């Protein structure tokens, strides 16, 4: 499929930290998912998840923050 739900990440393989839901929802948006709140826990602690984000943004995967 051409996009996922996940952790929106850098090209350092590094979580979006928040404070806010709104925040999270214009990042993912912006990027061309659906929509995205912040989790205050999850697979990586803190972070924005997005829902159907395209697969040329980069997502969380297995391994460092670098």
Request: hydrophobic share 25%.
């Given at each position: ?6 952790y929106?990440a ?57």
């Amino acid at each position: 499929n051409s996009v996922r739900d996940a952790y929106i990440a850098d090209p350092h393989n590094c979580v979006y930290e928040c404070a806010r839901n709104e925040y999270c929802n214009d990042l993912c948006t912006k990027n061309g998912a659906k929509s995205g709140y912040c989790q205050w826990v999850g697979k990586y602690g803190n972070g924005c998840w997005c829902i159907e984000l395209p697969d040329n943004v980069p997502i969380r995967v297995p391994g460092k923050c670098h």
